[PDB]
């Protein structure tokens with residue numbers, strides 16, 4: 001039941017390693033899932049809905065992880081606390097690079113994908129800003145830029161820079177160096193006078 | 194001569210204010226330029242080549258401006274020196290937002306557009322890194338991250354954050370606040386211990 005649904009999702013993620021969604025047909029997905037074409041259409045309306053489900057699954061995994069961390073602070077210094085959050089993305093999206101690439105390709109023209117991403121970004125930006133504001137209130141960080149603006153730019157930086165790293169874009173920070181690079185810019189800009 | 198070429202480019206930029214390149218036909222461009230379809234094909238091979246030319250023109254304008262600044266340093270403090278460079282983008286791409294939007298949409302699937310962007314980003318990243326290295330050598334900045342990695346992340350941040358601002362994306366830093374936001378993150382991360 002969910003078995004055929006899971007098989008379809010698995011096939012799509014496997015195929016997305018090799019080519020883009022426009023070179024993948026519903027028939028390829030059904031065939032990889034061991035089902036016929038009209039059976040496919042009972043679980044999904046289109047190959048784009050399959051991508052949307054993969055993306056929704058990845059983004060919810062990252063969001064649940066961050067929600068765990070937020071409830072269970074590490075006992076370590078500030079620099080390590082920001083690193084542990086950024087590492088959620090580095091690990092979760094970094095474990096699903098083909099899905100990430102296809103999501104980015106899609107939101108060029110898909111309103112559902114853009115909106116899904118936006119909702120989550122708003123949430124994590126707000127959380128980031130709430131932390132920065134808490135740090136200023138406790139006297140740990142200086143009141144420099146408006147926290148929400150700062151949190152928007154640092155979150156967008158991470159989106160773009162992790163994407164380029166995972167893609168191996170030229171230019172890009174090597175994947176082995178991207179987390180230390182991001183952490184340095186977050187700590188200096190949040191705590192720096 | 195260049196007159197009909199200039200008219201075609203002008204028509205394409207005007208139309209790109211209203212819809213994407215996929216809703217624009219060669220016939221629309223010719224008609225707006227006052228020429229026939231086969232006459233269009235004498236100046237350009239396709240509507241995509243017209244976009245590529247607009248993009249090449251915008252990116253060369255920004256690059257020539259930065260080359261002017263690099264040759265003619267302002268007499269002001271460090272913070273203002275970085276602001277003057279970032280402002281080149283804010284002004285040049287910000288004066289051509291529809292072309293910028295269409296360029297971003299395109300590089301989702303166009304190798305020529307991706308490569309053109311990449312070449313220039315490499316150049317400005319290298320320049321940024323050379324400055325950071327000069328600042329460390331003169332004892333004005335601390336030796337923290339490798340300069341080239343730092344310069345890659347800060348340049349990618351600007352690309353993504355200015356794009357979102359100019360687009361009015363949700364989330365995005367308002368256009369009136371984006372330059373001060375970027376400058377703060379560049380100065381703290383370059384000069385911050």
Ligand SMILES: O=C(NCC1CCN(c2ncccn2)CC1)N1CCCC1
Nearest residue numbers: 066069070085086089124128155158159
């Ligand atoms: O790296 C990021 N964001 C990092 C932030 C860091 C702070 N934060 C968080 N920290 C501790 C617990 C829960 N949340 C929210 C996530 N992004 C890449 C794709 C878009 C966002």
Ligand SMILES: O=C(NCC1CCN(c2ncccn2)CC1)N1CCCC1
Nearest residue numbers: 055059089093100103104116117162163
């Ligand atoms: O590039 C990004 N984020 C932006 C894209 C947006 C499209 N898309 C997506 N995914 C889930 C839900 C909705 N949209 C894949 C992510 N990252 C690189 C690694 C960290 C996140």
Ligand SMILES: O=C(NCC1CCN(c2ncccn2)CC1)N1CCCC1
Nearest residue numbers: 259262263278279282317321348351352
């Ligand atoms: O805002 C940026 N980059 C800013 C840098 C700042 C330093 N710099 C420069 N400074 C003084 C003179 C010449 N060059 C090179 C450009 N970007 C947005 C799109 C991609 C790059």
Ligand SMILES: O=C(NCC1CCN(c2ncccn2)CC1)N1CCCC1
Nearest residue numbers: 248252282286293296297309310355356
């Ligand atoms: O988003 C960006 N940059 C990236 C895109 C890349 C596609 N594209 C482009 N343009 C010229 C030459 C090649 N590609 C338009 C720019 N910016 C926002 C304002 C500052 C630059």
